Design a protein around this ligand. Sequence first.
Ligand SMILES: O=C(O)[C@H]1O[C@@H](Oc2cc3ccccc3oc2=O)[C@H](O)[C@@H](O)[C@@H]1O
Ligand SMILES: O=C(O)[C@H]1O[C@@H](Oc2cc3ccccc3oc2=O)[C@H](O)[C@@H](O)[C@@H]1O
Lengths: 627, 622
Amino acid sequence: NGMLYPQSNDSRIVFPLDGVWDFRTAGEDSYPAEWADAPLPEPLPMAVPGSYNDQNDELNLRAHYGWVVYQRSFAVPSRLVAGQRMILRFDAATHAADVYLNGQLLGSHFGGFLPFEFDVTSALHAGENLLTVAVDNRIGSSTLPVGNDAGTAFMGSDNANVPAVAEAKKHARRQNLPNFDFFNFAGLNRHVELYTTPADAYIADIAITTERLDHIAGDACTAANALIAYDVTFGGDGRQVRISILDGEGTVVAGVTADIERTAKASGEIAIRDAKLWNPGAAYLYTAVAELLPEGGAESSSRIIDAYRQTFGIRTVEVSGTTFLINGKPFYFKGFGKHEDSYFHGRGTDDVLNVKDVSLIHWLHANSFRTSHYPYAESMYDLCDREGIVIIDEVPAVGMSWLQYANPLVAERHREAIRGMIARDKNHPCIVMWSIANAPGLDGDGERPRQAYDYFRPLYELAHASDPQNRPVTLVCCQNDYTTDITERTMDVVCINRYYGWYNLSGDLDAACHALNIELDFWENIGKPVMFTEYGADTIEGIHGTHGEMFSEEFQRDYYARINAEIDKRPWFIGEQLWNFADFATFQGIIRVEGNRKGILTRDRQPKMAAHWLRERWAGIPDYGYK
Amino acid sequence: NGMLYPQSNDSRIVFPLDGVWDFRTAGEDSYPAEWADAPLPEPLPMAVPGSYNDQNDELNLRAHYGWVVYQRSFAVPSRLVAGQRMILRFDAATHAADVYLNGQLLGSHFGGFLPFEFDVTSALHAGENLLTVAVDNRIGSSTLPVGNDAGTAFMGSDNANVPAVAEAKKHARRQNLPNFDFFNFAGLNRHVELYTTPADAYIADIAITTERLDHIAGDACTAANALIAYDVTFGGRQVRISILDGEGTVVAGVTADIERTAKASGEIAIRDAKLWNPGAAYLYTAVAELLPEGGSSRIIDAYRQTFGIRTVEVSGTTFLINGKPFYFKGFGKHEDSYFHGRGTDDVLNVKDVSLIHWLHANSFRTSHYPYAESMYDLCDREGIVIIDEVPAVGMSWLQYANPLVAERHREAIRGMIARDKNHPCIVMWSIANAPGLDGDGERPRQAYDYFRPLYELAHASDPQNRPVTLVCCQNDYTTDITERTMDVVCINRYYGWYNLSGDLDAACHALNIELDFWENIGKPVMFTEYGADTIEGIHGTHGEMFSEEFQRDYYARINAEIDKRPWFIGEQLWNFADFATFQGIIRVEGNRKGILTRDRQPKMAAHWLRERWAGIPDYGYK
Ligand SMILES: O=C(O)[C@H]1O[C@@H](Oc2cc3ccccc3oc2=O)[C@H](O)[C@@H](O)[C@@H]1O
Ligand SMILES: O=C(O)[C@H]1O[C@@H](Oc2cc3ccccc3oc2=O)[C@H](O)[C@@H](O)[C@@H]1O
């Protein structure tokens, strides 16, 4: 179950396989088997990592439906593979992939936003190796994220009662129809790499938890004592593992040698005196170095069999009444939902962009975001660990309704996504909360609200069982009839998406604020902490008015000014994450002006009027103690 | 010299001639005179008032050089012309016109921004009359505004040393090359109307002045006594002068003797007078009624002249309105809009005045030509102060020696002041924009010798004797010897835009060095231009030139510096709104230094300035 990010050290090496690959589009329902067994005929170039859709303007790959096939060759010195365990890792292949090496299927995966890997020790050979990866972009009623098997995309226009329209639909070209509001970018969206570990015995997983903090300082920078726990899992086959705790300067401040017991694990606790805590706006990271010792322990030899360096931060998270406590201090979220989205790359990971976006989060005086609507690339979490930005980590369970709740295949994929996200991400101190879905159907009459609850409650429990830190769990709720939804109010933090004054009461900020206050009165009675995870207004940079109407920069600024003045009056409202950080691509349609334009930044990360207004507001709101 | 705006009353009627006229383009240096003798052949439609250039997308009338010909027919009842003096008034024909009625040349005019009229009493006849108006758009080294006879337009790019360029220039299509930074919009830009007066004796001109205020209230809303003067000129005995307040109540009145050349003049004391102020307009009406011999109750002629009671005085480094130290907040404007060009549009004037209030500004300058008369009436009623400017833009030493230019300059000054003298909203005259004033050898003295008589002329022409300025281009202020002699120093400066580009620290340092120079000069000083081209929608976290943020940052930094100077009495920025120019490599669909877009939408800087100006009082800021 461990998926530690590949590391290079004295016992391990990583060989990236990124670069310009060969590529062919394939069929709507299948691809040629022979393409895995020999070089692709007449290949196109395709950079990896990246979405494929915007990498070829001769083709219309945004319209592609079905399979594509990637391929490349590689060779490595025999000297480096000898005696080692060889693993091929795919950080993400969106949505489903079949991976072949030298004409043999290594295996398959479903789930477009989480990593998977194969043991290729026996499949590799000397000299050039031929790696082929078939990737399927199709979405439908059984995928996460969810597609529509017929009709229109989410937020699509129709005239379904016109006989000519009904007839033309029957014969129209097959297309993915997202039941979600972001473009279905597909392909090898994240890195590919070959890596090595020792074969006889190796470190397979590490979990670090902050179990307890004693006498936390007034400023939350330190605690008199921190109790941390480690759990190390091994693969392979009186053995021991040395655990060293390094502080921010790399000095060993704690260390223990633990017995490995059988499935093989070592676990224990370590007390850290005068512990330096991790906080939003004030990151501090330690490293847990795990070193597998040879048979005979340190008593017999100085050599190290295997090693892995796991970053971690010491901090607690606790929901208490209507507060969200980090290191016992009442936190207030400032930020937004994001997307992994950019020109050229699509959903492809881009660390230049991640580094820039983290600086923009600081420029705005924001302190947090949500990984709307899928787990992000691993590097972004490491960056937010070092930069003191809090994350709500969310699985790709977007577009769901009652059709999905009855389907065992969907429930299995949903559990896989929750387990996989938490297994990948559990050691990040920046992650303070898990989201098990975005905007599923929860309300209505008859049995529908109960059916939704019965689907989601076990997933809430799974997210708690899976996280060794036991962080809060939420479900991000779409604008709905909050009085018949019986699921959202059971979450640990209530996370609501609301578009009062945009999708309803349009343009009327007085009415919008009145409606918002009626719903806030409902949440006030429930007595849980509540935050916005979405609210906003599509905004075309450069459209201006003295009395700003919808789509103007002024309306977007006025929107936030009015709504935020209302939530400031509620002590139990513990965060404001708006929609969205930046404009992003969507399926085309009559309400999407070259995608979603609710960004406070443009797609090129330039600030609209509302961004300047929010920057000034957020400059004056502290991370702790605002409420 | 009186040019009272036409009025309808019991003794006078106005017959508007606006509408869709017939139109033809003509030649570079000529037009067919015979077109005045018959309907124009194969005419195009052309709305009047309006520039013609943007009224026909099949043609490229922005490229037109030379003459066009307008024409229409009209008829009026014989009973109404009978016994009357009939006057045909052109509010503006840009730049020069030959006017014919029924094939008879009435005369011509040069000067594209001031009204002119003809007595058509004898040329009119019963039934349909045919009015033909040839309009010349050409500009050059002897016109105001100034054109270039060769080379490029102002701030145009060139590669003059490339032989192919030099040769191609010799054979290129003739084009007006403005030596000014706005498009050369031409045609019947303002209204046309026929009007009547009595023929035997009539009112030709009226001047009302505020001579003295006694015991002005602390809030300047009133004075214990105001002494006003009237001067009424007649064409073609007694005149009754009645002073009506804001409710139409006659609060003062005198009957004055007419003496010959025929004029009546005197003074009237108004106790507890209600004063006109920026942000708090109050208007009276002086009604002049020509009485019959000798004498009966009946009225021979009448005219109703709006005015406001207020004084204007420069005192040391202060600009006093009703004895209170005023601070200018505002901008240069243009008469410029999509479709209309330089054409007057009162929907746009009403909207723009509301935007001036929305911004919390209190003033503007008529850059760079007198505006339509209706805009001044609007600013009279809306309490917005005006600096009134003649079209003497683009001038340099080439012009100062040209007698035709000098005569046209004197004509514009006399004509502007004769037309506009009664507006209380006008507090200062500008005799030029951005002429060449600095340099070495004899050049600075040559400029002074040209402009000083025009300064004196503006003072001699205005019965209110308001301050006179000359709006100065960014220049070597140490060798300019003319600007510092004006009543108010009005400077155009672009530190950080056209120089020290993008570096606001350096721009502010340079500005402060020049402010130190003006501090020593000891006159009141204001900005009349400063700004940055800005494309709405271009944004940056660290705003660079052309972004909305840079424009906002520009004003935030520069205004913080002038706030430190007690003698700096106003900030008029460039510009109220984006406007059209001749095309070139520094004009992105015109001049983009507007704080509003050309469609009057607010850029980031407009919101910032609105908040700043909201906190600055009209009186007492310094
Ligand atoms: O609409 C968006 O910009 C985002 O919408 C979110 O879901 C919601 C959509 C609608 C539509 C109509 C009326 C109310 C709604 O309230 C919502 O909460 C979605 O989570 C985002 O991914 C979309 O981009
Ligand atoms: O440039 C403008 O936007 C306005 O320029 C004014 O005259 C000046 C132009 C320049 C050019 C280069 C360096 C300094 C300058 O300083 C000026 O004062 C002119 O009055 C306006 O009409 C222009 O639109």
